[PDB]
Amino acid sequence: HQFGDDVILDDVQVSCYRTLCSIYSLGTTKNTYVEKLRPALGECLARLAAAMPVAFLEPQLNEYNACSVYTTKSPRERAILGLPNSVEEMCPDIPVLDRLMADIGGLAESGARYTEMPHVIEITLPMLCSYLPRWWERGPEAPPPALPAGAPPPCTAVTSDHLNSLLGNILRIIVNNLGIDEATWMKRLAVFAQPIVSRARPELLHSHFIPTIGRLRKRAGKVVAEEEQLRLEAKAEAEEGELLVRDEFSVLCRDLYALYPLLIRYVDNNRAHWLTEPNANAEELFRMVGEIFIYWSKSHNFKREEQNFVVQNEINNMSFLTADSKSKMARRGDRYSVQTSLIVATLKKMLPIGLNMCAPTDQDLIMLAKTRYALKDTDEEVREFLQNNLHLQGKVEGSPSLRWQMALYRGLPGREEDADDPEKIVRRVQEVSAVLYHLEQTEHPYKSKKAVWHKLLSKQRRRAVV
């Protein structure tokens, strides 16, 4: 409710400043009570940093900060009450924002694991995930309606560059820890890094997100290869190894829920740019996230591990989708629902990128190739069947609907007639044909008329079985 500027003003300010200062002073401490209280302490200062009205990591610009003691109060006062007479001395043990970001900066690129950075992950990162968004809107690059009130200089030095550097840095810290057994903190940086992804730059997509998700794609492909390896050779030992893939599918579902919430809010902020002007990498990432989904749609273990992870860790799976509506000042499956499941939420939010590759002339091939997939054909059976049926693609003259769809498609800046090579068309229909095939298996499960409410013998014989 933005009460920081009018509640924490004069003597509450020193009070929480003492609270903020002691909680972080836990850095040089390594105790067991510290270990379990880090999630409690990390969330405590994260909500504190969003509320503190003073740029407590940027002491050099406090002379421009009216909502602080050093401007509201005279130097004659602030001496009867114990103060070090300088705003820079109030908490000397918190490194400045330029320093603090640089501290994490070398830490992530060094490949360190979570054991050597428990404070950085549990406490230092959450405050930065909350400190930086607070001082974006009151610093440079803000949209100032300051025609009458433009006289006061900005009292902080936070720009989009700082936010983007941290986000990729947090992305780098997760991939360093991508494969370890236990990490209950990934869901916590998942919920802390959302406010800072709103100002990522489009250069972030290629450098970080494509390599990280690609590793997850080849991770899932390797594991599902082991799974189908088990099922092709049935044995009583397959159970000893079914738990192996279950453990491997659990760590993947942990990693998917560690990165996908960052992609979802990233994608929402970049679809408009990707569709108005076509992007090569965006089409690649769809092919990446798409292949992971078809694994989950095909593998049965991936389905249960995704559901097991949500219920055990109490993933909201609803705030990850409603964040934009609430940020913009806006029952049935509240616990869990496949409609709001992140893996299919990622694809449904990323379908337009894949469908944008195909020209409307391929609409016949999409329905054509979907039929083969509904007949349980592999990705190579469709390719040859698409190759020999290239003359079935639609004709513009024979369809009034295609006349305008073509014209809109040809008007796109990145469209070239040379892109309609026989190998290029058959690829782009084959990749999507797998996607829309499995998606309609989920929105319409068509599992009805198989086990309907049947009341075989219960309604009159429930007493006997009890």
Partner 1 sequence: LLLQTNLINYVTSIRPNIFVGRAEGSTQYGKWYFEVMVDEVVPFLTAQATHLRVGWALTEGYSPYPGGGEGWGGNGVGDDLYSYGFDGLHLWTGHVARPVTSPGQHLLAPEDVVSCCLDLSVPSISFRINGCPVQGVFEAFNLDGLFFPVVSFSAGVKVRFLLGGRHGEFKFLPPPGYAPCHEAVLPRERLRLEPIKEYRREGPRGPHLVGPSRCLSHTDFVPCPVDTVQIVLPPHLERIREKLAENIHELWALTRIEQGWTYGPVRDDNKRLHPCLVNFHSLPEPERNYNLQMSGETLKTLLALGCHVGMADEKAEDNLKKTKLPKTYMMSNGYKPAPLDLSHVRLTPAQTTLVDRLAENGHNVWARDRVAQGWSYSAVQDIPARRNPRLVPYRLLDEATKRSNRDSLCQAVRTLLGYGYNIEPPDQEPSQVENQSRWDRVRIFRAEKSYTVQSGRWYFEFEAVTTGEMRVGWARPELRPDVELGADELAYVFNGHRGQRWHLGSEPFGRPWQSGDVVGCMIDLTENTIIFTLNGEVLMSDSGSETAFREIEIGDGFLPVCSLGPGQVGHLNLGQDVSSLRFFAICGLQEGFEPFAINMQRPVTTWFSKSLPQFEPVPPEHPHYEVARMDGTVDTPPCLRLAHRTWGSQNSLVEMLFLRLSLPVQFHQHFRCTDNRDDPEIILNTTTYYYSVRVFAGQEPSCVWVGWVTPDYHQHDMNFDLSKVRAVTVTMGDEQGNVHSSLKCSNCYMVWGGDFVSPGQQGRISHTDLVIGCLVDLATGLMTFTANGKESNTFFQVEPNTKLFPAVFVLPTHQNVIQFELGKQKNIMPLSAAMFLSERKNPAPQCPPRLEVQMLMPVSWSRMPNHFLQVETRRAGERLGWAVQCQDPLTMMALHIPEENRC
Which chain residues interact with partner 1 by CB under 8 A? 268, 271-272, 275-276, 318, 321-322, 324-325, 328-331, 333, 337, 339-340, 351-352, 355-356, 400-401, 404, 407-408, 411
Q: Judged by CB, which is closer to partner 1: 132, or 345?
A: 345
Instruction: Please report how close the Cβ of residue 325 comes to partner 1 at its closest, in angstroms.
Output: 5
Instruction: Please report how close the Cβ of residue 190 comes to partner 1 at its closest, in angstroms.
Output: 18
Instruction: Please report how close the Cβ of residue 175 comes to partner 1 at its closest, in angstroms.
Output: 29
Taking the C-alpha atoms of residue 155 and residue 138, their distance in angstroms, rounded to an integer, is 8
Instruction: Please report how close the Cβ of residue 84 comes to partner 1 at its closest, in angstroms.
Output: 30
Q: Judged by CB, which is closer to partner 1: 59, or 360?
A: 360
111: phi > 0 → left, psi -120 to 50 → alpha, else beta; which?
Answer: left
Instruction: Please report how close the Cβ of residue 155 comes to partner 1 at its closest, in angstroms.
Output: 23
Q: Judged by CB, which is closer to partner 1: 7, or 40?
A: 7
Taking the C-alpha atoms of residue 104 and residue 169, their distance in angstroms, rounded to an integer, is 8
Q: Which residue has the tokens 């020193």?
A: 14
Taking the C-alpha atoms of residue 148 and residue 157, their distance in angstroms, rounded to an integer, is 22
The structure tokens listed for 332 are: 């049935």
Cα-based distances in Å from 191 to 47, 145, 257: 13, 32, 10
Q: Judged by CB, which is closer to partner 1: 322, or 458?
A: 322
Q: Judged by CB, which is closer to partner 1: 21, or 355?
A: 355
Q: Judged by CB, which is closer to partner 1: 391, or 444?
A: 444
Instruction: Please report how close the Cβ of residue 430 comes to partner 1 at its closest, in angstroms.
Output: 18
The structure tokens listed for 370 are: 């979907």
Q: Which residue has the tokens 């693609």?
A: 393
Q: Judged by CB, which is closer to partner 1: 247, or 440?
A: 440
Tell me if 394 sits within 8 A of 364, measured CB to CB: yes
- CA 157 to chain CA mean position, Å: 27
Q: Judged by CB, which is closer to partner 1: 268, or 284?
A: 268
Tell me if 266 sits within 8 A of 206, measured CB to CB: no
Instruction: Please report how close the Cβ of residue 341 comes to partner 1 at its closest, in angstroms.
Output: 11
What are the helix and strand counts (H, E) for the chain?
24, 0
Taking the C-alpha atoms of residue 254 and residue 44, their distance in angstroms, rounded to an integer, is 24
Other CB atoms within 10 Å distance of the CB of residue 339: 13
Q: Judged by CB, which is closer to partner 1: 149, or 456?
A: 149
Instruction: Please report how close the Cβ of residue 382 comes to partner 1 at its closest, in angstroms.
Output: 21
Taking the C-alpha atoms of residue 251 and residue 174, their distance in angstroms, rounded to an integer, is 13
Instruction: Please report how close the Cβ of residue 328 comes to partner 1 at its closest, in angstroms.
Output: 5
DSSP characters over 286-308: HHHHHHHHHHHHH-HHHHHHHHH
Instruction: Please report how close the Cβ of residue 233 comes to partner 1 at its closest, in angstroms.
Output: 41
Q: Where are the beta strands (DSSP E) in 234-376?
A: none
Other CB atoms within 10 Å distance of the CB of residue 318: 14
Instruction: Please report how close the Cβ of residue 333 comes to partner 1 at its closest, in angstroms.
Output: 8
Long-range interactions of 62-67: CB distance < 8 A, separation 24+: 62/87, 62/155, 63/155, 64/152, 64/153, 64/154, 64/155, 65/155, 65/156, 66/152, 66/155, 67/4, 67/5, 67/9
Q: Judged by CB, which is closer to partner 1: 333, or 422?
A: 333
Tell me if 303 sits within 8 A of 296, measured CB to CB: yes
Q: Judged by CB, which is closer to partner 1: 364, or 377?
A: 364
Q: Judged by CB, which is closer to partner 1: 238, or 407?
A: 407
Instruction: Please report how close the Cβ of residue 317 comes to partner 1 at its closest, in angstroms.
Output: 8
SS3 breakdown of the chain: % helix, strand, coil, rounded to 5?
Answer: 65, 0, 35
Taking the C-alpha atoms of residue 343 and residue 349, their distance in angstroms, rounded to an integer, is 10
